[model samples]
Target chain A: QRSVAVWRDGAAVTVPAHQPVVTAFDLGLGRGDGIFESVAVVAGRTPHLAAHLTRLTRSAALLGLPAPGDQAWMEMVAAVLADWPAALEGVCRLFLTRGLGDGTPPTALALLAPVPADTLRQRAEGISVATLGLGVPADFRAGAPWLLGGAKTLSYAVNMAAQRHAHDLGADDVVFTSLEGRLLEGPTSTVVWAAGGTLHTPPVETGILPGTTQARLFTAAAADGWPTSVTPGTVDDLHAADAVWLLSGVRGAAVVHTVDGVRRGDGDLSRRVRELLA
Target chain B: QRSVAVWRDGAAVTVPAHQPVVTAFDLGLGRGDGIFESVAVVAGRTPHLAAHLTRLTRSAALLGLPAPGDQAWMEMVAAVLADWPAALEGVCRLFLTRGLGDGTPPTALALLAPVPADTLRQRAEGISVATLGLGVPADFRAGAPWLLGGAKTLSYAVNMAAQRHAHDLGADDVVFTSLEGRLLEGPTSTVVWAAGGTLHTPPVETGILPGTTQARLFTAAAADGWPTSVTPGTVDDLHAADAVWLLSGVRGAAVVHTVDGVRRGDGDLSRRVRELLA
Candidate 1:
């Protein structure tokens, strides 16, 4: 139930109670365009600020947005944290658009807001995931046009829709699947599962975001001799696994309750992931 | 390009130029927080505003964003158009997200701006289209979970990337081919061509937007003695056609020149389409 948003040009105002500050793509709003990076604020500071910013720059480049340059954007992020600095364990978001320009449609006003803490806690246990195979099919969209698979931008309607579709199916979150029914990932997180003494996740090169937490856990798992590997797996791999965890900020690692409406994961995957990270 | 924006939350501020706005999604930058829709705004008013709004509301409902009742949003749009009446042509986009809700995230912002008109006088003459054999292979991901195929949401990083991939193929745009190398549609528009004295386009249920202009033209074409039909055809069919017209909001109907880098299709599909519409 964490709220997320970005402010488009001329739409930046104080964050509303029930409204999120939002930035879609500036191409339709600001410079008529730009891409954005969203960092999770943990304990009053962004946990992976550098990683997130680096990814943002890469995404902007991929989408052909004028790089506002990382330094400036990072400074702005730091300043925002300094101003808001309240969330001890919730979520904070940052948005950037190609600032607004002239007849050139300058990208402007990349907005930011913090998600409330209570909502984050309620979903702490785990979320019911309804598999909604709704979104741009990966195979066809791969390497096509912009190749923003590795980049994060303000365009994210399908991500939310997937989650909503899950909720409609009586689940709390949603995971996307590849055109070939490979277990892609959760709406906004990486899906990591343990199968037969080994932890497995989809290949990052397979167009999944190189999630910071998932990457760190993989390293830790490697240290623990658990041996983490990336393969193009299917829902069967998840169902056949000892446990599955969706890794991201706030929720950290949400173990799945029902895989496609059938309970198929271990609840302790969360604490296990915590211990692994620790 | 014209600059236009409307703040759904009146409280959102207008930050001074060079000021900053931050952005992030709660779980991770891509942690599945919201969804978005992009509509082309031609002549200041969003063409097919009613239909687009209907889709947005449907998208929001499916995604669990509060149903922004259609009539209210339509009135708001009317206000925006009145505010910027001189706007004759451009892309108008709307992004709605679950915002920083007390429970979950609330709806974020919807930004609208003018994309510079394409120098498409050349498109009316002829535009090369590269058939990448791209598009969702129906057998796969056809029923995968979290699939929101009919709904347009913000998770468009992949879609935008796909378009850019086509641009890199030394072509103005790209049309996707089904797994069997059949012609589907361009990344953002429909593929229509003339053959055997009839006009054909891939069916929308084939996993594409329910295109507004294409639908209207289908009816209008029938009245003009050109019977409309939907069929699954191959890229070869497009090549053998007398003329091809790719239909959408801004581009209207554009002619295809080459498929898979092969010279194909007669030019003047756009002018003919204009004549057909006019």
Candidate 2:
């Protein structure tokens, strides 16, 4: 059973795992006016909680929703994580939604559950990704604050659909390209490529989410004398790179050996990059 | 207090208005993998019930979700309507989510609440709108079924954000334009314009939600000998039209008196259109 804790009206409480906890009127469930973050917790400790919280607040700001204080969120996370099995590698998911409108307070919850075995397998065996056209330019979201491009909100139906589309094509995941032929990030992962002994990823100016794992890897790589840069490229650029990777918090770093069924990249450095993340 | 009814696992029940009802793990709240329809209930009767249900099923098919049968939804609506006050104008909102992962049953609910006075005011006094670019060309989602453009999903964070952005600009609503300079539709409404004594709305081929209210209005107007057509136009075209309106189920037809702070459209026909809807 999943362990879940909800913070409401200045108090945190644990609810039954299989029971309902949200109202039929909550805007988050009604309209998806909410923001969330999936955090990786290893050995009962979350290594990147601060970064996730920062992004959560950023998302709240973008959606014009009230964000709870960091202390409150931390307390709620503690309550959920306390009930999490210590032997299992878990994911801590924090969610906040505009509550039942009309000046009602926001709804906040944290759910802790074991990471799926398939995700761990992908981290080890890497993943195959298909390129799908997003049908918009890379910078299309620029100056369009209402688009919520940079904010990670609960409106992820498109992202989920894209991943399913990739799976239907027998691929493990998806990397979206812009209508103007520029490479965007994966549906739930950051697109990173390596060439000439330097690592590069798509710039956030492309309106992609600023990936937490990608940022950590870039920082650690720079410290280890492996230079990194945010560069805009195309599908052709990915195909031409020495290696390509899809990075996320729970998925860690997964090498992409093929794009749209065409084999590319040696993938010899996947283990090495995973070591860096570790 | 608000009135809400939930239908789940072949059961319909009512709960307190302020109670929690959704689980932390429901995909509708987790990933917004859901579909919903809002209908106007006047005097305990829903005028466009059939149309709303048809669209809900269409949306379910598009999202690859298992749609509850029309009979189940109808039963749920009946239960909720029974609790709603007969004299008050209310909105009946139906929701269905993919439910918790790993084959859990879908979460379905219906909420009934009195329509806000502002919605009626907007319908009567007219509204000022801001034209915002959706940052994608018309027909961008034509072949991209995963984008879920033509479907009404719960992933409406951007739509809500757009409306808030309009409100921040001191406008009441928004009409989206495509990156290719073609008119789209409103966030929660359909774009309708009149010129040369004909009623025109943007074609659904542009990847906009097929508005039920707009369709009914067009059908009635055609029968009344006012010509109707689904055509592609631009912001400039809107400025040039004789009058413009935003049509929705709950709000009826609201006139667009201004766009981007510039006055256009006389709004003389809003009452007549409302009467047709009535």
Candidate 3:
């Protein structure tokens, strides 16, 4: 069993790992009407805490949900972190749901748990990925706020399904494409390709989430004199890239060694990208 | 506060309505990796229990989650219904998530709660609806099984957002349209129209839920010698129709008196249809 800590409402709640901490009426669980952020805790401190909180507030605004101010979230995190083991590298998840669906105050929770070993393994050994059609135009939901395309809400069933489909096909993850054959994004990460000595990721105009890690990495890469561009790509373009990776906040970055069973990317630049991120 | 009875892990569990009943680790709450169905209970009996269960099973299959057998669901429902007041009209919700991220058995839950007053009001006074673009072509998700287009999963943040958008626009509901200018569905209801002395509804092939209530009403309409057809319609087509309605399981059928503030339906056919459904 994994060690867990939970904070709810306005105070700390004693919840064992094996028990419950949210009501069945909470829209977070009932209708998936919520927004959340998962921040990596390194030595009991979150490195990208501010960035994640900014994104969370933006997501709440996009979803028309009430945003918990930084102080509320910070207090919740502190409450949970108080019980978390100091030596364990864990994750702190902050969730704000529309509440119990009966005009109640929004439900807020912070959960702390040790990071999975598989996440660490994927960052080290790389990953095999599959490209799947997302079945919509690249810019279909560009200006549609109600579609929640660019927001990272808790409605991740389709994303989870894509990942499961990739696993069933013997791949580690999925990179989605639009119906018009334009590369979109990975289920939980940003698709980054390196070619012509420049790193490129699909533009957020394609209706994909603005990845926090991708943004930070691109900023750092710019300081390191690595040219970066946000441009659209195709499957053929991905195949022709010198190197490819899926960058995410929690998992850092994972090199894509194979796409649809065709071995690519020699892992040369991936190591450098990892070191740059580090 | 409302009264809620919960059934989990194949047995009846003591769960207070005001207290929590789910851990933060459950993907159903965390990532919305799950499927769900809601059934209306009237006078201590669900009107369409079997159909809801069938859809739940099909939705589970579509998402690659294990389907709890009908017997299991029936027993669970019985356990919750035992505590529910026989005089109160309520709703029973069935949920199955991918479970804790650690691969524990799928988290299955049954919750019974009193029907909201708003649902009852909408059923009586009717609802004014606005047409909005879903930003995808009608055929966009035709062959994408991983997209889970027609499945009623717990990942309803977009749907909920659309409904909230409608509310913000001073409308009671929404009728979603495809980018190709085809009528799709309401946020939680199926789109239904009547014209040429025949009833019509958008087909499930349009990437919408195969509504249990709509299906039963269609079957009953056939038995009543009212001609019925599964056809696609555009917003203009709906405006030109004799009548329109948004149909669902819990609230029965609510008449769509106006579309985008334009009064269209007379409720003449809607009253007859409701009587037919009764």
Best by TM-score: 2
Give chain B TM-scores in order. 0.81, 0.97, 0.95
lDDT of 3 by residue, A1-278 (tens): 33344444556554566677788788999899999998888787888888999989989889878765887887777767775666778888888888876366777778778878998899889899999987678877776778887788889998999898899999999999988889999999999999999999998988898998889889989999999998889998788999999998888898888999999965488867877888
User: Which digits, one per residue and each the tens of the lDDT, describe model 1 over residues A1-278?
Assistant: 23322333423333332342323433323221345554666666666777776777676677766654555555555544545545444344445454333234434233345454533653466766765543345554444445456666655655655665666678877777765677777767888888767788887656667788788898888887777788788878877878887887556777776787788757455576779865
Top of the candidates by DockQ? 2
Residues B1-278 of candidate 2: C-alpha lDDT, one tens digit per residue: 37777875687787777777888889999888899999899888987899999999999888788877888888888888876777899999999899886377777888888889999999878899999988887878788888888899999999999999999999999999988889999999999998888889998988899999999988888877889988888998789998999999988888999989989866476666776676
lDDT of 1 at A79: 45
Report, for candidate 3, the interface RMSD: 1.4
Provide the lDDT at B151 for model 1: 56
RMSD for each of the candidates: 5.5, 1.3, 1.9
Predicted candidate 1 versus true structure: per-residue lDDT over B113-213, tens digit per residue: 45544634634565777676544564433454345555555454545455566677777777777666667667667788888877888765555666777
Which tens-of-lDDT digit does each residue in B69-137 have in candidate 3? 788788767767876777888888988888875357787777888888989999998899988887777
Per-model TM against the reference:
0.78, 0.98, 0.96
| Ten contiguous residues with the weakest lDDT in model 2 chain A | A265-274
Candidate order (TM-score): 2, 3, 1
- In terms of docking quality, model 3 is medium
As for DockQ, the candidate ahead, 2 or 3, is 2
